[PDB]
Amino acid sequence: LPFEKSTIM
Amino acid sequence: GSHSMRYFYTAMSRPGRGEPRFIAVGYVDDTQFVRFDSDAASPRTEPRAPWIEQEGPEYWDRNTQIFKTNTQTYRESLRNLRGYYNQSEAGSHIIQRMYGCDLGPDGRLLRGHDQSAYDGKDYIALNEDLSSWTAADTAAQITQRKWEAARVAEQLRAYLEGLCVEWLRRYLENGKETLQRADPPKTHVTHHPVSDHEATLRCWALGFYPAEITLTWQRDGEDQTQDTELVETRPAGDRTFQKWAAVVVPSGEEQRYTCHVQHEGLPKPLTLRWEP
C-alpha cells in the first residue's frame, strides 16, 4: 500500500 | 529471509507534448505487483502479480486516488523545481522518488527509506532516524522547509513503521508460494577457444530468484576480480534472473579455475569447473 499524503516540493 | 517493499515514482515533464507523465510501480523484493500510469487510456492502479488480484475494490480505489493526487502534486513540483534552478520552460526534467520499508528475517522493521532525485541527481532524502531531511543544495532546502511545515517526516515515520510493514507482511503471506520461495540457480560452465593458446570459461546461473547472487572465478583458490567479465543480473521475463561470469584462461590451465556460486535457494554453495 503506498504512502497516502502528497506534498508539493 | 529478509524482505522489502518499495514504490518507485517517475514524473517527467515534456514541454510542447502535453502535461507531465506520472508513473508509479510497486515492488515486494524483486517482484513488481502494481502499476499506475497517468498516460494510460483510463488511468487506474492495475495489478501486476497474481497474489494482489484478491484485494477488494476499496484497495484499488484507495490506490487510484493517491496516485491521481500524486499526478497533480508532481506537476506542481516540476514547475517549482524548474523555478528553483532558474531553468527555461524548454527542457524536459524528471523527478524520481523511491520509498519503502525493509524487514529482517524475523519480520521486524530494519529501516525505512524515502529519497527523491531531480534529473537523476540526489535532491532530498529522509534520514535513517525518519525525523530529519538531507537536502542536496539550496533548491532542495526550499522543499525541506515546505516538508517541515506540512510535517511530512512525521507522516512518513508513521507510515513506514505502521502501514508499510503491515501491508508488506500481508503481501508476503498472500504471495508466500512465490515471494517466500527462493529458486536456486541452474548452473553450467561453457568453454570457448579464443586463440590457439587461450579460451574463455563462462560460468552460467539461470532461473534464480531473488536477483541477489554472487558469481566469482578463482585461479588456484584466489579471486579473479580484475580478470572476470561479469554481466549485470538480467530478468528472464518469467520472474527469474540470469547472470554469467567469464575468464580468459591460458590453454591447458582450465583445471586451475573454479566458479563459486552463492544464492539463497541453494542447499549448499556451488563449486564448478569446466567438465570436458
Binding site: - | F8, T10, M12, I23, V25, Y27, Q32, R35, D37, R48, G91, S92, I94, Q96, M98, A117, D119, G120, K121, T190, H192, R202, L206, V231, E232, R234, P235, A236, G237, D238, Q242, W244
Partner: protein
C-alpha cells in the same frame, strides 16, 4: 544535464534449442533520461507485437526496461535489438549471441 547511456543485453528466456519456441529479450538498463526507443529485429526487420515491462529504476536512479517477444530460434535466422537514446548519435544494434 548529466545523461547516462544504456547498457544493452540480448538473450533468450530459456536455453536456446533450434525449432523450439522461446522468448527473445532485450534488457536496457543504466540509462537516464527515461525516453528510449527499443526494437527487436528478425533478419534486420522490426518484429511487431513486442511487449515491455513498466518503467522502473535502480538505487542509482538509472532506468531499466525489458522488451520481449515469443520467437523460434533457427540455425540461420539472425536476431538483434536496436536501441536509440539521446546519448546515442545513431541507433545501436546488438546481435543475439546464444553463448551470451
Amino acid at each position: 544535464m548529466i545523461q547516462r547511456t544504456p547498457k544493452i543485453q540480448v538473450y533468450s528466456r530459456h536455453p536456446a534449442e533450434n525449432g523450439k519456441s522461446n522468448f527473445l529479450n532485450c534488457y536496457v538498463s543504466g540509462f537516464h533520461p527515461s525516453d528510449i526507443e527499443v526494437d527487436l529485429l528478425k533478419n534486420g526487420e522490426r518484429i511487431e507485437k513486442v511487449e515491455h515491462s513498466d518503467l522502473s529504476f535502480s538505487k542509482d536512479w538509472s532506468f531499466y526496461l525489458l522488451y520481449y517477444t515469443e520467437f523460434t530460434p533457427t540455425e540461420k535466422d539472425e536476431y538483434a535489438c536496436r536501441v536509440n537514446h539521446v546519448t546515442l548519435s545513431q541507433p545501436k544494434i546488438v546481435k543475439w549471441d546464444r553463448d551470451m
